[PDB]
Amino acid sequence: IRTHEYSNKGKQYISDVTGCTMVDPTNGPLPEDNEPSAYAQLDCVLEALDR
Amino acid sequence: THSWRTKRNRSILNTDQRNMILEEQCYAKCCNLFEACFNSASYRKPVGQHSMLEAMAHRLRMDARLDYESGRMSKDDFEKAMAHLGEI
Amino acid sequence: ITSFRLNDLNGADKGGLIPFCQDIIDSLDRPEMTFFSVKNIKKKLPAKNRK
Amino acid sequence: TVTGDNTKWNECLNPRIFLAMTERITRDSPIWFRDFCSIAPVLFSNKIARLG
Amino acid sequence: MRLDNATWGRITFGPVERVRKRVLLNPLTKEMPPDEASNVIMEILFPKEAGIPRESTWIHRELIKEKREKLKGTMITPIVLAYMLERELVARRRFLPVAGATSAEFIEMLHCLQGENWRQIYHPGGNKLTESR
Amino acid sequence: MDTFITRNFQTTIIQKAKNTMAEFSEDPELQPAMLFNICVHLEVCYVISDMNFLDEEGKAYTALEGQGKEQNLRPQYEVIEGMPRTIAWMVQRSLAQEHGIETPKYLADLFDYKTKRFIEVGITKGLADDYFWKKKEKLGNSMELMIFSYNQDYSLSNESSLDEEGKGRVLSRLTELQAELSLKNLWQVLIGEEDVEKGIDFKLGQTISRLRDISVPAGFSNFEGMRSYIDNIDPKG
RNA sequence: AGUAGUAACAAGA
RNA sequence: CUGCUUCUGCUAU
RNA sequence: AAUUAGCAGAAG
Ligand SMILES: [Mg+2]
Ligand SMILES: [Mg+2]
* DSSP codes, chain F: -HHHHHHHS-HHHHHHHHHHHHTTT--GGG-HHHHHHHHHHHHHHHHHTSSEEE-SSS-EEE--SS--GGG--SBSEEE-BTB-HHHHHHHHHHHHHHTT-PPPSS--SEEETTTTEEEEEEEESS-HHHHHHHHHHHTTTSSEEEEEETTS-EEE-SS--S-HHHHHHHHHHHHHHHHHHHHTT-HHHHHS-------------SHHHHHHHTSS-TT--SHHHHHHHHHH-----
Kindly report the bases of strand I lying within 7 A of a protein C-beta atom. 2-4
> CA distances (Å), B21 to each of B14, C28, F52, in order?
15, 32, 50
Protein residues within 5 Å, CB atom, of ion ligand 2:
F 81, 109
Is the CB of residue A47 less than 8 Å from the CB of residue F236?
yes
Relative to beta strand F117-124, strand F144-149 is parallel
Distance CA D45, CA D34 (A): 17
The angle subtended at Cα F222 by Cα F220 and Cα F223, nearest 5°, is 100
F234 is in an annotated binding site: no
Measured between beta carbons, the chain F residues lying within 8 angstroms of D45 are 215
Q: Beta-carbon neighbour count of residue F36 at 10 Å? A: 22
* F110 CA from centroid of ligand 2 (Å): 9
Report whether D32 belongs to an annotated binding site.
no
Torsion E88-E91-E96-E101 (CA) sign: positive
Asked if the Cβ of residue E76 lies within 7 A of any atom of strand H, the reply is no
Q: Distance (Å, rounded) from C-alpha E80 to C-alpha B21?
A: 29
Distance of CA E106 to the CA centre of its chain: 12
Q: Which residues of chain F lie closer than 8 angstroms to E52, CB-CB? A: 89
Inter-chain contact C29–F206, Cβ cutoff 8 Å?
yes
Neighbours of chain B (3+ CB pairs under 8 A): C, E, F
Length of chain D as a residue count: 52
CA within 13 Å, CB half, F149: 15
Point out the nucleotide closest to E92 (alpha carbon to C1′).
I3
Q: How far is the CA of D11 from the C1' of G5 (A)?
A: 26
> Cα torsion for F67, F69, F71, F77, to the nearest 10°?
110
Q: Note the CA–C1' distance, B13 to G9, in angstroms.
A: 16
Q: Is C18 on the interface with F (CB under 8 A)?
A: yes
D and E touching (3 or more beta-carbon pairs closer than 8 Å): no
Query: How far is the C-alpha of B42 from the C-alpha of F135, rounded, in Å?
Result: 38
Give the DSSP letter string of B16-77.
--SHHHHHHHHHHHHHHHHHHH-GGGGTSPPP-SS-HHHHHHHHHHHHHHHHHHTSSS-HHH
Experimental method reported for this structure: cryo-EM
Which chain B residues have any C-beta within 8 angstroms of a chain C C-beta? Answer: 20, 47, 49
Q: CA-CA distance, D44 to D42, in Å (whole number)?
A: 5
Look at residue A14 and give its three-state secondary structure: strand
- Judged by DSSP in three states, B83 sits in helix
Phi, psi angle pair for C13, to nearest 5°: -85, 5
Burial of E39 (0-12, 13-18, 19+ CB in 10 A): buried
The distance (Å) linking the CA of B14 with the C1' of H6 is 41
The reply to whether F114 falls in a domain is: yes
Instruction: Name the residue among F126, F165, F164, F163 with its Cα closest to residue F147.
Output: F126
Find the residue closest to I3 using CA and C1' atoms. Answer: E33
Residue B14 burial by Cβ neighbours in a 10 Å radius (0-12, 13-18, 19+) = exposed
D20-52 b/e (C-beta count within 10 Å ≥ 16 → b): bbbbbebeeeeeeebbbbbbebbbebbeeeeee
Q: Which strand (E) or helix (H) includes residue A11?
A: strand A11-14
F219 contacts on A by Cβ (under 8 Å): 27, 42
Bridge partners of residue F135, in order along the sequence: none
- Report how far ligand 1's centroid is from the alpha carbon of D8 (Å): 14
From the CA of A34, how many Å to the C1' of H7? 36
Residues 6+ apart with CB under 8 A from F81: F20, F41, F42, F45, F88, F107, F108, F109, F110, F121
Neighbours of B80 (CB within 10 A): 13
Residue F205's contacts (CB-CB under 8 Å, 6 or more residues apart) are C25, C26, C28, C29
After which residues is chain D discontinuous, taking C to N > 2.5 Å?
Answer: none
| CB distance B48 to F86 below 8 Å | yes
Question: Could you tell me which of E97, E94, E100 has the C-alpha nearest to residue E121?
Answer: E100
Of F218, F130, F216, which Cα lies nearest the Cα of A10? Answer: F218
Q: Is the CB of E84 under 7 A from strand H?
A: no
Cα–Cα dist E121/E93, whole Å: 23
Which residues on adjacent β-strands are paired with residue F111? F78, F118
The DSSP element (H or E) to which E84 belongs, if any, is helix E78-89
Domain-located, residue F130: yes
C-alpha span between F127 and B70 (Å, rounded): 42
> Residues F146, F122: contact at Cβ < 8 Å?
yes
Question: Which residue approaches H8 most closely, CA to C1'?
Answer: E94
Listing DSSP states for E5-69 in one string gives T-EEEEEEES----EEEEEE-S--SS-B-HHHHHHHHHHHH--TT--S--TTTTTTHHHHHHHHH
- Reported structure resolution in angstroms: 3.2
Q: Residues F27-33: contacts with CB within 8 Å, 24+ apart?
A: F29/F2, F30/F194, F30/F196, F30/F198, F31/F194, F31/F196, F32/F1, F32/F2, F32/F5, F32/F189, F33/F1, F33/F189, F33/F190, F33/F194
Question: Which of B66, B75, B82 minimises the CB distance to F98?
Answer: B66
Q: How far apart are CA C14 and CA C1, in angstroms?
A: 12
- Cβ contacts of F130-137, under 8 Å, gap ≥ 24: F131/F155
The answer to whether residues F125 and F131 touch, using CB atoms and an 8 Å cutoff, is no
Its domain, for residue F43, covers: 1-198
Could you tell me which residues are beta bridge partners of residue A14? A21
For residue F214, tell me if it sits in a domain.
no
Rounded CA Rg of chain B: 19
Q: F80 with F106: CB under 8 angstroms?
A: no
Strand partners, E94: E23
E39, E48, E54: which to substitute to probe chain F, counting the most F Cβ within 10 Å? Answer: E48
DSSP C12: G
Phi and psi at E26, nearest 5°, equal: -125, 145
Taking phi over 0 as left and psi of -120 to 50 as alpha, with beta for the rest, F3 belongs to alpha
Residues from E contacting F (CB-CB < 8 Å) are: 47-53
Contact A15 F237 (CB under 8 A): no
Ligand 2 center from residue B1 Cα (angstroms):
52
Q: What is the tally of structural domains in chain F? A: 1
Beta bridge partners of F124: F149
List Cβ neighbours of E33 (8 Å cut-off, separation of 6 or more): none
In E 76-105, which Cβ lie closer than 7 Å to strand I?
91, 93
DSSP character at residue C17: S
Of F20, F74, F30, F19, nearest to F52 by C-alpha is F74
Ligand positioned closest to the Cα atom of D3: 1
Q: Is D10 annotated as a binding residue?
A: yes
In terms of residues, how long is chain B?
88
Of A8, A27, D19, give the one whose Cα is nearest residue F218: A27
CA of E20 to C1' of H7 (A): 15
**Nearest CA-CA distance, residue B53 and chain C, Å:** 15
Residue F47 marked in a binding site: no
Separation of CA F76 from chain center: 22
Question: Any chain E CB within 8 A of the CB of F105?
Answer: yes
Report CA(F122)–ligand 2 centroid distance (Å).
8
Q: Which residues pair with F117 in a beta bridge?
A: F112
Give the Cα-Cα-Cα angle B50, B51, B54 (nearest 5 degrees).
100
Whole-angstrom distance, CA of residue F143 vs CA of residue F118:
5
**Number of Cβ pairs < 8 A linking chain A and chain F:** 32
Who among D11, D17, D25 is closest to A3 (CB)?
A: D11
Question: Does residue B85 sit in helix, strand or coil?
Answer: helix
In Å, what is the separation between the CA of D46 and the C1' of H9? 40
Q: Report the nucleotide nearest the CA of residue E79, measured to C1'.
A: H12
Please check whether residue F216 lies inside any domain of the structure: no
Measured CA to CA, the distance from residue F133 to residue F127 in angstroms comes to 11
